[PDB]
Amino acid sequence: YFQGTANLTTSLLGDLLDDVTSIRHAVLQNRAAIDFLLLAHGHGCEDVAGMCSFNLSDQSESIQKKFQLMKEHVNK
Amino acid sequence: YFQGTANLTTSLLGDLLDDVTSIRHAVLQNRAAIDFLLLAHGHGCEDVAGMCSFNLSDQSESIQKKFQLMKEHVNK
Amino acid sequence: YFQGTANLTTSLLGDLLDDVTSIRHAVLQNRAAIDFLLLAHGHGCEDVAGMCSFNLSDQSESIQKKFQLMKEHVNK
Ligand SMILES: [Cl-]
């Protein structure tokens, strides 16, 4: 049914949001590690494109609320 | 039609799953590279937040099967 | 309505595509940083699994056009 397709979509998006959140966290831990290494070479994060930045696209707020709204709409 | 919207959604999700899988793999290769560098400074991965961990959110199993179920449901 | 579910889905996918694009960019900047460090140890990217590669799964073209087609179809 349409409820079928819809519920599959939200289930799937749920899993995918959680994997992407997890990916982002790892990338930022990786960047922090990199900056410690640059430090130990006597270099600052400014010596490497992007390495000072820890404010990635983080539309996490927006996505969680829309996801909730979608579920509540799709499964009620 | 609804089949239209649905088939666009699964096509798109297909591409996105493949890009996210690929991203995760790269992040884990990046972390492995980092740990080799920490090693060469005489440090262990325990000296850097997260650097020992290679078990990221990996709901890949779950997502592939739901994706398959969605396609088969959406396009049959 | 179905337009409801649909418009929520595209809004959400929009945010997610933008976050994933942003993630990928960061991972590639992280890899570039890593390679500079390997260099400073007298090693080439060939000494570390994946570190030479900057051509990640990048189905960005395909996804943007399908996303556009989906919106135009879903919200018209
Ligand atoms: Cl990374």
PDB file of all heavy atoms in Angstrom, chain A residues 16 20 23-24 27 31 34 41 48 51 56-59 62-63 66-67 70 73-74, chain C residues 1 4-5 8-9 11-12 15-16 18-19 22-23 26-27 29-30 33-34 37 41, unseen atoms left out:
ATOM      1  N   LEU A  16      19.680   5.569   7.686  1.00  0.00           N
ATOM      2  CA  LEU A  16      20.643   6.385   6.968  1.00  0.00           C
ATOM      3  C   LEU A  16      21.074   7.662   7.701  1.00  0.00           C
ATOM      4  O   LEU A  16      22.254   8.045   7.654  1.00  0.00           O
ATOM      5  CB  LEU A  16      20.079   6.761   5.630  1.00  0.00           C
ATOM      6  CG  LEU A  16      21.043   7.410   4.668  1.00  0.00           C
ATOM      7  CD1 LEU A  16      21.985   6.366   4.169  1.00  0.00           C
ATOM      8  CD2 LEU A  16      20.268   8.052   3.547  1.00  0.00           C
ATOM      9  N   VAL A  20      24.897   8.594   8.862  1.00  0.00           N
ATOM     10  CA  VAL A  20      25.524   9.831   8.413  1.00  0.00           C
ATOM     11  C   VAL A  20      26.000  10.710   9.562  1.00  0.00           C
ATOM     12  O   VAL A  20      27.027  11.390   9.459  1.00  0.00           O
ATOM     13  CB  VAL A  20      24.612  10.651   7.533  1.00  0.00           C
ATOM     14  CG1 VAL A  20      25.240  12.004   7.208  1.00  0.00           C
ATOM     15  CG2 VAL A  20      24.326   9.956   6.239  1.00  0.00           C
ATOM     16  N   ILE A  23      29.148   9.050  10.652  1.00  0.00           N
ATOM     17  CA  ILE A  23      30.196   9.379   9.727  1.00  0.00           C
ATOM     18  C   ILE A  23      30.761  10.752  10.031  1.00  0.00           C
ATOM     19  O   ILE A  23      31.963  10.889  10.146  1.00  0.00           O
ATOM     20  CB  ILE A  23      29.750   9.295   8.300  1.00  0.00           C
ATOM     21  CG1 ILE A  23      29.651   7.826   7.896  1.00  0.00           C
ATOM     22  CG2 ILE A  23      30.783   9.998   7.362  1.00  0.00           C
ATOM     23  CD1 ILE A  23      28.837   7.581   6.625  1.00  0.00           C
ATOM     24  N   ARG A  24      29.907  11.742  10.188  1.00  0.00           N
ATOM     25  CA  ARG A  24      30.353  13.093  10.435  1.00  0.00           C
ATOM     26  C   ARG A  24      31.187  13.195  11.682  1.00  0.00           C
ATOM     27  O   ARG A  24      32.193  13.886  11.717  1.00  0.00           O
ATOM     28  CB  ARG A  24      29.156  14.013  10.541  1.00  0.00           C
ATOM     29  CG  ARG A  24      29.508  15.462  10.821  1.00  0.00           C
ATOM     30  CD  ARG A  24      28.307  16.398  10.615  1.00  0.00           C
ATOM     31  NE  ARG A  24      27.090  15.718  11.032  1.00  0.00           N
ATOM     32  CZ  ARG A  24      26.005  15.543  10.280  1.00  0.00           C
ATOM     33  NH1 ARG A  24      25.923  16.041   9.052  1.00  0.00           N
ATOM     34  NH2 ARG A  24      24.983  14.862  10.777  1.00  0.00           N
ATOM     35  N   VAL A  27      34.665  11.917  11.051  1.00  0.00           N
ATOM     36  CA  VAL A  27      35.447  12.806  10.230  1.00  0.00           C
ATOM     37  C   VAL A  27      35.989  13.942  11.036  1.00  0.00           C
ATOM     38  O   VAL A  27      37.100  14.405  10.816  1.00  0.00           O
ATOM     39  CB  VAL A  27      34.549  13.381   9.147  1.00  0.00           C
ATOM     40  CG1 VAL A  27      35.271  14.410   8.303  1.00  0.00           C
ATOM     41  CG2 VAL A  27      34.115  12.266   8.272  1.00  0.00           C
ATOM     42  N   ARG A  31      39.817  14.867  11.779  1.00  0.00           N
ATOM     43  CA  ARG A  31      40.394  16.218  11.656  1.00  0.00           C
ATOM     44  C   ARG A  31      41.120  16.704  12.924  1.00  0.00           C
ATOM     45  O   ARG A  31      42.239  17.201  12.840  1.00  0.00           O
ATOM     46  CB  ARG A  31      39.339  17.221  11.219  1.00  0.00           C
ATOM     47  CG  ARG A  31      39.863  18.646  10.999  1.00  0.00           C
ATOM     48  CD  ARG A  31      38.792  19.436  10.187  1.00  0.00           C
ATOM     49  NE  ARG A  31      38.713  18.900   8.821  1.00  0.00           N
ATOM     50  CZ  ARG A  31      37.903  19.369   7.885  1.00  0.00           C
ATOM     51  NH1 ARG A  31      37.135  20.369   8.171  1.00  0.00           N
ATOM     52  NH2 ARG A  31      37.905  18.871   6.675  1.00  0.00           N
ATOM     53  N   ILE A  34      44.430  14.919  12.996  1.00  0.00           N
ATOM     54  CA  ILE A  34      45.301  15.553  12.043  1.00  0.00           C
ATOM     55  C   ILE A  34      45.948  16.830  12.594  1.00  0.00           C
ATOM     56  O   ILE A  34      47.139  17.050  12.407  1.00  0.00           O
ATOM     57  CB  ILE A  34      44.527  15.864  10.761  1.00  0.00           C
ATOM     58  CG1 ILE A  34      44.335  14.559   9.998  1.00  0.00           C
ATOM     59  CG2 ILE A  34      45.281  16.843   9.894  1.00  0.00           C
ATOM     60  CD1 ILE A  34      43.186  14.545   8.984  1.00  0.00           C
ATOM     61  N   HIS A  41      54.499  18.771  14.174  1.00  0.00           N
ATOM     62  CA  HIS A  41      55.457  19.170  13.160  1.00  0.00           C
ATOM     63  C   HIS A  41      55.778  20.647  13.216  1.00  0.00           C
ATOM     64  O   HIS A  41      56.547  21.157  12.388  1.00  0.00           O
ATOM     65  CB  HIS A  41      54.924  18.821  11.777  1.00  0.00           C
ATOM     66  CG  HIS A  41      55.137  17.393  11.419  1.00  0.00           C
ATOM     67  ND1 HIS A  41      54.297  16.389  11.845  1.00  0.00           N
ATOM     68  CD2 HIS A  41      56.136  16.789  10.739  1.00  0.00           C
ATOM     69  CE1 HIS A  41      54.738  15.229  11.389  1.00  0.00           C
ATOM     70  NE2 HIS A  41      55.859  15.444  10.725  1.00  0.00           N
ATOM     71  N   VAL A  48      47.000  24.033   6.417  1.00  0.00           N
ATOM     72  CA  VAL A  48      46.365  23.002   5.603  1.00  0.00           C
ATOM     73  C   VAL A  48      44.886  23.338   5.387  1.00  0.00           C
ATOM     74  O   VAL A  48      44.094  23.487   6.327  1.00  0.00           O
ATOM     75  CB  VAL A  48      46.508  21.591   6.222  1.00  0.00           C
ATOM     76  CG1 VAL A  48      46.080  20.533   5.238  1.00  0.00           C
ATOM     77  CG2 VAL A  48      47.928  21.291   6.625  1.00  0.00           C
ATOM     78  N   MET A  51      41.671  22.700   7.746  1.00  0.00           N
ATOM     79  CA  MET A  51      41.971  21.870   8.920  1.00  0.00           C
ATOM     80  C   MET A  51      41.580  22.533  10.245  1.00  0.00           C
ATOM     81  O   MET A  51      41.470  21.856  11.279  1.00  0.00           O
ATOM     82  CB  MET A  51      43.411  21.412   8.912  1.00  0.00           C
ATOM     83  CG  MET A  51      43.668  20.359   7.883  1.00  0.00           C
ATOM     84  SD  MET A  51      42.556  18.914   8.005  1.00  0.00           S
ATOM     85  CE  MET A  51      41.492  19.184   6.630  1.00  0.00           C
ATOM     86  N   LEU A  56      31.048  21.699  10.104  1.00  0.00           N
ATOM     87  CA  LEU A  56      30.599  21.105   8.860  1.00  0.00           C
ATOM     88  C   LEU A  56      29.127  21.362   8.707  1.00  0.00           C
ATOM     89  O   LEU A  56      28.473  21.767   9.675  1.00  0.00           O
ATOM     90  CB  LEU A  56      30.800  19.598   8.900  1.00  0.00           C
ATOM     91  CG  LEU A  56      32.248  19.162   8.925  1.00  0.00           C
ATOM     92  CD1 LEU A  56      32.353  17.707   8.468  1.00  0.00           C
ATOM     93  CD2 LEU A  56      33.056  20.092   8.038  1.00  0.00           C
ATOM     94  N   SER A  57      28.604  21.129   7.502  1.00  0.00           N
ATOM     95  CA  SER A  57      27.165  21.193   7.290  1.00  0.00           C
ATOM     96  C   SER A  57      26.563  20.232   8.301  1.00  0.00           C
ATOM     97  O   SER A  57      26.920  19.048   8.368  1.00  0.00           O
ATOM     98  CB  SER A  57      26.778  20.816   5.859  1.00  0.00           C
ATOM     99  OG  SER A  57      25.381  21.012   5.620  1.00  0.00           O
ATOM    100  N   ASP A  58      25.652  20.761   9.099  1.00  0.00           N
ATOM    101  CA  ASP A  58      25.195  20.066  10.277  1.00  0.00           C
ATOM    102  C   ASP A  58      23.709  20.300  10.461  1.00  0.00           C
ATOM    103  O   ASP A  58      23.241  20.617  11.556  1.00  0.00           O
ATOM    104  CB  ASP A  58      25.974  20.590  11.473  1.00  0.00           C
ATOM    105  CG  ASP A  58      26.519  19.489  12.321  1.00  0.00           C
ATOM    106  OD1 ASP A  58      25.698  18.908  13.062  1.00  0.00           O
ATOM    107  OD2 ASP A  58      27.751  19.203  12.244  1.00  0.00           O
ATOM    108  N   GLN A  59      22.965  20.121   9.377  1.00  0.00           N
ATOM    109  CA  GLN A  59      21.554  20.393   9.362  1.00  0.00           C
ATOM    110  C   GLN A  59      20.831  19.329  10.187  1.00  0.00           C
ATOM    111  O   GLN A  59      19.679  18.976   9.895  1.00  0.00           O
ATOM    112  CB  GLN A  59      21.064  20.429   7.900  1.00  0.00           C
ATOM    113  N   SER A  62      17.377  20.381  11.804  1.00  0.00           N
ATOM    114  CA  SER A  62      16.317  20.475  10.829  1.00  0.00           C
ATOM    115  C   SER A  62      15.826  19.097  10.379  1.00  0.00           C
ATOM    116  O   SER A  62      14.620  18.862  10.174  1.00  0.00           O
ATOM    117  CB  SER A  62      16.866  21.258   9.638  1.00  0.00           C
ATOM    118  OG  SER A  62      15.915  21.414   8.601  1.00  0.00           O
ATOM    119  N   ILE A  63      16.776  18.188  10.209  1.00  0.00           N
ATOM    120  CA  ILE A  63      16.482  16.875   9.655  1.00  0.00           C
ATOM    121  C   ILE A  63      15.732  16.017  10.658  1.00  0.00           C
ATOM    122  O   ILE A  63      14.780  15.357  10.285  1.00  0.00           O
ATOM    123  CB  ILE A  63      17.769  16.164   9.238  1.00  0.00           C
ATOM    124  CG1 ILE A  63      18.409  16.931   8.081  1.00  0.00           C
ATOM    125  CG2 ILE A  63      17.459  14.787   8.816  1.00  0.00           C
ATOM    126  CD1 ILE A  63      19.879  16.612   7.845  1.00  0.00           C
ATOM    127  N   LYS A  66      12.025  17.209  10.882  1.00  0.00           N
ATOM    128  CA  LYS A  66      11.306  16.795   9.668  1.00  0.00           C
ATOM    129  C   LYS A  66      11.087  15.283   9.603  1.00  0.00           C
ATOM    130  O   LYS A  66      10.055  14.802   9.102  1.00  0.00           O
ATOM    131  CB  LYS A  66      12.052  17.203   8.388  1.00  0.00           C
ATOM    132  CG  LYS A  66      12.068  18.673   8.110  1.00  0.00           C
ATOM    133  CD  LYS A  66      12.587  19.001   6.728  1.00  0.00           C
ATOM    134  CE  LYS A  66      13.381  20.287   6.807  1.00  0.00           C
ATOM    135  NZ  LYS A  66      13.617  20.927   5.521  1.00  0.00           N
ATOM    136  N   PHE A  67      12.094  14.539  10.040  1.00  0.00           N
ATOM    137  CA  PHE A  67      11.974  13.103  10.131  1.00  0.00           C
ATOM    138  C   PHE A  67      10.844  12.740  11.095  1.00  0.00           C
ATOM    139  O   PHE A  67       9.953  11.982  10.742  1.00  0.00           O
ATOM    140  CB  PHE A  67      13.311  12.477  10.536  1.00  0.00           C
ATOM    141  CG  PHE A  67      13.310  10.980  10.507  1.00  0.00           C
ATOM    142  CD1 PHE A  67      13.029  10.301   9.340  1.00  0.00           C
ATOM    143  CD2 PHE A  67      13.586  10.268  11.628  1.00  0.00           C
ATOM    144  CE1 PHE A  67      13.014   8.920   9.317  1.00  0.00           C
ATOM    145  CE2 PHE A  67      13.576   8.896  11.623  1.00  0.00           C
ATOM    146  CZ  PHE A  67      13.291   8.215  10.463  1.00  0.00           C
ATOM    147  N   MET A  70       7.617  13.457   9.668  1.00  0.00           N
ATOM    148  CA  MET A  70       7.287  12.556   8.566  1.00  0.00           C
ATOM    149  C   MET A  70       6.710  11.257   9.089  1.00  0.00           C
ATOM    150  O   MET A  70       5.763  10.729   8.523  1.00  0.00           O
ATOM    151  CB  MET A  70       8.537  12.229   7.759  1.00  0.00           C
ATOM    152  CG  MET A  70       8.287  11.417   6.530  1.00  0.00           C
ATOM    153  SD  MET A  70       9.867  10.936   5.781  1.00  0.00           S
ATOM    154  CE  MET A  70      10.675  12.514   5.594  1.00  0.00           C
ATOM    155  N   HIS A  73       3.293  11.601  10.521  1.00  0.00           N
ATOM    156  CA  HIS A  73       2.353  11.855   9.435  1.00  0.00           C
ATOM    157  C   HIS A  73       2.136  10.557   8.661  1.00  0.00           C
ATOM    158  O   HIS A  73       1.021  10.211   8.274  1.00  0.00           O
ATOM    159  CB  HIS A  73       2.928  12.956   8.537  1.00  0.00           C
ATOM    160  CG  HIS A  73       2.169  13.185   7.263  1.00  0.00           C
ATOM    161  ND1 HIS A  73       1.126  14.086   7.166  1.00  0.00           N
ATOM    162  CD2 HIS A  73       2.332  12.666   6.023  1.00  0.00           C
ATOM    163  CE1 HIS A  73       0.665  14.091   5.927  1.00  0.00           C
ATOM    164  NE2 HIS A  73       1.378  13.238   5.211  1.00  0.00           N
ATOM    165  N   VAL A  74       3.219   9.821   8.465  1.00  0.00           N
ATOM    166  CA  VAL A  74       3.176   8.625   7.647  1.00  0.00           C
ATOM    167  C   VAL A  74       2.510   7.464   8.390  1.00  0.00           C
ATOM    168  O   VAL A  74       1.788   6.677   7.781  1.00  0.00           O
ATOM    169  CB  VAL A  74       4.589   8.208   7.183  1.00  0.00           C
ATOM    170  CG1 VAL A  74       4.587   6.806   6.678  1.00  0.00           C
ATOM    171  CG2 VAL A  74       5.112   9.129   6.090  1.00  0.00           C
TER     172      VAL A  74
ATOM    173  N   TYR C   1      -1.653  14.512   3.346  1.00  0.00           N
ATOM    174  CA  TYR C   1      -1.994  14.022   2.031  1.00  0.00           C
ATOM    175  C   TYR C   1      -0.732  13.352   1.481  1.00  0.00           C
ATOM    176  O   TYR C   1       0.315  13.346   2.135  1.00  0.00           O
ATOM    177  CB  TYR C   1      -2.413  15.202   1.161  1.00  0.00           C
ATOM    178  CG  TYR C   1      -3.073  14.795  -0.104  1.00  0.00           C
ATOM    179  CD1 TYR C   1      -3.518  13.483  -0.281  1.00  0.00           C
ATOM    180  CD2 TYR C   1      -3.282  15.709  -1.131  1.00  0.00           C
ATOM    181  CE1 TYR C   1      -4.138  13.092  -1.436  1.00  0.00           C
ATOM    182  CE2 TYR C   1      -3.901  15.324  -2.300  1.00  0.00           C
ATOM    183  CZ  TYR C   1      -4.327  14.010  -2.444  1.00  0.00           C
ATOM    184  OH  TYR C   1      -4.929  13.583  -3.598  1.00  0.00           O
ATOM    185  N   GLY C   4       1.725  15.822   0.993  1.00  0.00           N
ATOM    186  CA  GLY C   4       2.312  16.084   2.292  1.00  0.00           C
ATOM    187  C   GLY C   4       3.535  15.208   2.506  1.00  0.00           C
ATOM    188  O   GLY C   4       4.645  15.691   2.698  1.00  0.00           O
ATOM    189  N   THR C   5       3.329  13.903   2.446  1.00  0.00           N
ATOM    190  CA  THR C   5       4.409  12.980   2.667  1.00  0.00           C
ATOM    191  C   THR C   5       5.543  13.254   1.701  1.00  0.00           C
ATOM    192  O   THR C   5       6.728  13.199   2.050  1.00  0.00           O
ATOM    193  CB  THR C   5       3.956  11.540   2.460  1.00  0.00           C
ATOM    194  OG1 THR C   5       2.990  11.209   3.449  1.00  0.00           O
ATOM    195  CG2 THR C   5       5.141  10.600   2.622  1.00  0.00           C
ATOM    196  N   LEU C   8       7.491  16.389   2.401  1.00  0.00           N
ATOM    197  CA  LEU C   8       8.391  16.179   3.548  1.00  0.00           C
ATOM    198  C   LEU C   8       9.637  15.401   3.168  1.00  0.00           C
ATOM    199  O   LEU C   8      10.742  15.715   3.588  1.00  0.00           O
ATOM    200  CB  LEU C   8       7.673  15.447   4.662  1.00  0.00           C
ATOM    201  CG  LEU C   8       6.994  16.385   5.633  1.00  0.00           C
ATOM    202  CD1 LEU C   8       6.020  15.613   6.526  1.00  0.00           C
ATOM    203  CD2 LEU C   8       8.051  17.073   6.450  1.00  0.00           C
ATOM    204  N   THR C   9       9.451  14.371   2.376  1.00  0.00           N
ATOM    205  CA  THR C   9      10.541  13.568   1.872  1.00  0.00           C
ATOM    206  C   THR C   9      11.538  14.405   1.066  1.00  0.00           C
ATOM    207  O   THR C   9      12.735  14.325   1.288  1.00  0.00           O
ATOM    208  CB  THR C   9       9.983  12.454   1.003  1.00  0.00           C
ATOM    209  OG1 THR C   9       9.056  11.704   1.770  1.00  0.00           O
ATOM    210  CG2 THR C   9      11.044  11.545   0.558  1.00  0.00           C
ATOM    211  N   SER C  11      11.988  17.627   1.168  1.00  0.00           N
ATOM    212  CA  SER C  11      12.616  18.643   2.000  1.00  0.00           C
ATOM    213  C   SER C  11      13.733  17.955   2.746  1.00  0.00           C
ATOM    214  O   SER C  11      14.890  18.358   2.721  1.00  0.00           O
ATOM    215  CB  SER C  11      11.574  19.271   2.956  1.00  0.00           C
ATOM    216  OG  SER C  11      12.157  20.221   3.837  1.00  0.00           O
ATOM    217  N   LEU C  12      13.415  16.811   3.308  1.00  0.00           N
ATOM    218  CA  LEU C  12      14.386  16.100   4.102  1.00  0.00           C
ATOM    219  C   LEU C  12      15.596  15.662   3.229  1.00  0.00           C
ATOM    220  O   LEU C  12      16.740  15.898   3.591  1.00  0.00           O
ATOM    221  CB  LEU C  12      13.688  14.911   4.755  1.00  0.00           C
ATOM    222  CG  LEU C  12      14.531  14.174   5.765  1.00  0.00           C
ATOM    223  CD1 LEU C  12      13.656  13.476   6.783  1.00  0.00           C
ATOM    224  CD2 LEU C  12      15.385  13.212   5.037  1.00  0.00           C
ATOM    225  N   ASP C  15      18.083  18.459   2.619  1.00  0.00           N
ATOM    226  CA  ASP C  15      18.990  18.723   3.723  1.00  0.00           C
ATOM    227  C   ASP C  15      20.066  17.642   3.761  1.00  0.00           C
ATOM    228  O   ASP C  15      21.244  17.927   3.918  1.00  0.00           O
ATOM    229  CB  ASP C  15      18.232  18.796   5.055  1.00  0.00           C
ATOM    230  CG  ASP C  15      17.289  19.991   5.134  1.00  0.00           C
ATOM    231  OD1 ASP C  15      17.484  20.974   4.384  1.00  0.00           O
ATOM    232  OD2 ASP C  15      16.366  19.967   5.978  1.00  0.00           O
ATOM    233  N   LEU C  16      19.670  16.396   3.593  1.00  0.00           N
ATOM    234  CA  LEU C  16      20.614  15.297   3.674  1.00  0.00           C
ATOM    235  C   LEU C  16      21.675  15.279   2.568  1.00  0.00           C
ATOM    236  O   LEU C  16      22.846  14.956   2.824  1.00  0.00           O
ATOM    237  CB  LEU C  16      19.868  13.996   3.651  1.00  0.00           C
ATOM    238  CG  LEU C  16      20.681  12.764   3.962  1.00  0.00           C
ATOM    239  CD1 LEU C  16      20.987  12.759   5.423  1.00  0.00           C
ATOM    240  CD2 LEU C  16      19.909  11.540   3.544  1.00  0.00           C
ATOM    241  N   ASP C  18      22.807  17.952   1.025  1.00  0.00           N
ATOM    242  CA  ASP C  18      23.721  19.026   1.361  1.00  0.00           C
ATOM    243  C   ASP C  18      24.695  18.596   2.481  1.00  0.00           C
ATOM    244  O   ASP C  18      25.851  18.983   2.434  1.00  0.00           O
ATOM    245  CB  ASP C  18      22.983  20.272   1.822  1.00  0.00           C
ATOM    246  CG  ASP C  18      22.205  20.941   0.719  1.00  0.00           C
ATOM    247  OD1 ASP C  18      22.441  20.630  -0.468  1.00  0.00           O
ATOM    248  OD2 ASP C  18      21.365  21.804   1.061  1.00  0.00           O
ATOM    249  N   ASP C  19      24.238  17.834   3.488  1.00  0.00           N
ATOM    250  CA  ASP C  19      25.131  17.401   4.569  1.00  0.00           C
ATOM    251  C   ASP C  19      26.146  16.355   4.057  1.00  0.00           C
ATOM    252  O   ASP C  19      27.308  16.326   4.479  1.00  0.00           O
ATOM    253  CB  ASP C  19      24.360  16.859   5.791  1.00  0.00           C
ATOM    254  CG  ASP C  19      23.827  17.972   6.701  1.00  0.00           C
ATOM    255  OD1 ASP C  19      23.884  19.168   6.312  1.00  0.00           O
ATOM    256  OD2 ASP C  19      23.324  17.661   7.805  1.00  0.00           O
ATOM    257  N   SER C  22      28.877  17.914   2.015  1.00  0.00           N
ATOM    258  CA  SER C  22      29.753  18.637   2.911  1.00  0.00           C
ATOM    259  C   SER C  22      30.720  17.662   3.632  1.00  0.00           C
ATOM    260  O   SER C  22      31.928  17.944   3.841  1.00  0.00           O
ATOM    261  CB  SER C  22      28.849  19.408   3.866  1.00  0.00           C
ATOM    262  OG  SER C  22      29.505  19.761   5.064  1.00  0.00           O
ATOM    263  N   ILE C  23      30.176  16.512   4.000  1.00  0.00           N
ATOM    264  CA  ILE C  23      30.957  15.462   4.590  1.00  0.00           C
ATOM    265  C   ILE C  23      32.049  15.013   3.639  1.00  0.00           C
ATOM    266  O   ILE C  23      33.195  14.948   4.037  1.00  0.00           O
ATOM    267  CB  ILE C  23      30.120  14.297   5.021  1.00  0.00           C
ATOM    268  CG1 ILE C  23      29.376  14.666   6.301  1.00  0.00           C
ATOM    269  CG2 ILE C  23      31.021  13.054   5.312  1.00  0.00           C
ATOM    270  CD1 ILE C  23      28.200  13.746   6.629  1.00  0.00           C
ATOM    271  N   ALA C  26      34.967  17.381   3.341  1.00  0.00           N
ATOM    272  CA  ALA C  26      35.802  17.352   4.521  1.00  0.00           C
ATOM    273  C   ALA C  26      36.727  16.138   4.551  1.00  0.00           C
ATOM    274  O   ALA C  26      37.875  16.213   4.977  1.00  0.00           O
ATOM    275  CB  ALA C  26      34.913  17.356   5.763  1.00  0.00           C
ATOM    276  N   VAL C  27      36.223  15.016   4.102  1.00  0.00           N
ATOM    277  CA  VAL C  27      37.004  13.806   4.084  1.00  0.00           C
ATOM    278  C   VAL C  27      38.134  13.912   3.110  1.00  0.00           C
ATOM    279  O   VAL C  27      39.223  13.404   3.342  1.00  0.00           O
ATOM    280  CB  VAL C  27      36.110  12.658   3.647  1.00  0.00           C
ATOM    281  CG1 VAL C  27      36.883  11.364   3.499  1.00  0.00           C
ATOM    282  CG2 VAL C  27      35.063  12.472   4.682  1.00  0.00           C
ATOM    283  N   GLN C  29      39.560  16.845   2.124  1.00  0.00           N
ATOM    284  CA  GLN C  29      40.497  17.781   2.763  1.00  0.00           C
ATOM    285  C   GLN C  29      41.285  17.034   3.846  1.00  0.00           C
ATOM    286  O   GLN C  29      42.469  17.253   4.001  1.00  0.00           O
ATOM    287  CB  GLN C  29      39.740  18.946   3.420  1.00  0.00           C
ATOM    288  CG  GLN C  29      39.014  19.895   2.430  1.00  0.00           C
ATOM    289  CD  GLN C  29      38.337  21.020   3.156  1.00  0.00           C
ATOM    290  OE1 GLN C  29      37.648  20.806   4.179  1.00  0.00           O
ATOM    291  NE2 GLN C  29      38.524  22.215   2.661  1.00  0.00           N
ATOM    292  N   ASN C  30      40.625  16.155   4.604  1.00  0.00           N
ATOM    293  CA  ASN C  30      41.360  15.380   5.600  1.00  0.00           C
ATOM    294  C   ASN C  30      42.449  14.499   4.896  1.00  0.00           C
ATOM    295  O   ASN C  30      43.586  14.442   5.314  1.00  0.00           O
ATOM    296  CB  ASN C  30      40.422  14.508   6.442  1.00  0.00           C
ATOM    297  CG  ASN C  30      39.736  15.275   7.540  1.00  0.00           C
ATOM    298  OD1 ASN C  30      39.958  16.468   7.687  1.00  0.00           O
ATOM    299  ND2 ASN C  30      38.871  14.610   8.280  1.00  0.00           N
ATOM    300  N   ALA C  33      45.446  16.498   3.841  1.00  0.00           N
ATOM    301  CA  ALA C  33      46.238  16.812   5.020  1.00  0.00           C
ATOM    302  C   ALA C  33      47.119  15.628   5.439  1.00  0.00           C
ATOM    303  O   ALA C  33      48.320  15.759   5.704  1.00  0.00           O
ATOM    304  CB  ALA C  33      45.339  17.191   6.112  1.00  0.00           C
ATOM    305  N   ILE C  34      46.521  14.451   5.434  1.00  0.00           N
ATOM    306  CA  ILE C  34      47.250  13.242   5.711  1.00  0.00           C
ATOM    307  C   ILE C  34      48.450  13.049   4.776  1.00  0.00           C
ATOM    308  O   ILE C  34      49.529  12.682   5.223  1.00  0.00           O
ATOM    309  CB  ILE C  34      46.310  12.039   5.620  1.00  0.00           C
ATOM    310  CG1 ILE C  34      45.441  12.024   6.872  1.00  0.00           C
ATOM    311  CG2 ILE C  34      47.087  10.747   5.536  1.00  0.00           C
ATOM    312  CD1 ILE C  34      44.128  11.242   6.759  1.00  0.00           C
ATOM    313  N   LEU C  37      51.354  15.239   5.682  1.00  0.00           N
ATOM    314  CA  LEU C  37      52.065  14.601   6.765  1.00  0.00           C
ATOM    315  C   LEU C  37      52.936  13.377   6.361  1.00  0.00           C
ATOM    316  O   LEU C  37      54.041  13.239   6.833  1.00  0.00           O
ATOM    317  CB  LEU C  37      51.062  14.217   7.845  1.00  0.00           C
ATOM    318  CG  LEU C  37      50.548  15.464   8.595  1.00  0.00           C
ATOM    319  CD1 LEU C  37      49.281  15.159   9.325  1.00  0.00           C
ATOM    320  CD2 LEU C  37      51.534  15.929   9.578  1.00  0.00           C
ATOM    321  N   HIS C  41      57.180  12.781   6.536  1.00  0.00           N
ATOM    322  CA  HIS C  41      57.881  11.626   7.064  1.00  0.00           C
ATOM    323  C   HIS C  41      58.724  10.932   6.018  1.00  0.00           C
ATOM    324  O   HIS C  41      59.353   9.901   6.297  1.00  0.00           O
ATOM    325  CB  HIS C  41      56.883  10.636   7.648  1.00  0.00           C
ATOM    326  CG  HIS C  41      56.443  11.000   9.021  1.00  0.00           C
ATOM    327  ND1 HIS C  41      55.454  11.927   9.262  1.00  0.00           N
ATOM    328  CD2 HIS C  41      56.909  10.619  10.232  1.00  0.00           C
ATOM    329  CE1 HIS C  41      55.287  12.056  10.567  1.00  0.00           C
ATOM    330  NE2 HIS C  41      56.166  11.282  11.177  1.00  0.00           N
TER     331      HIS C  41
END
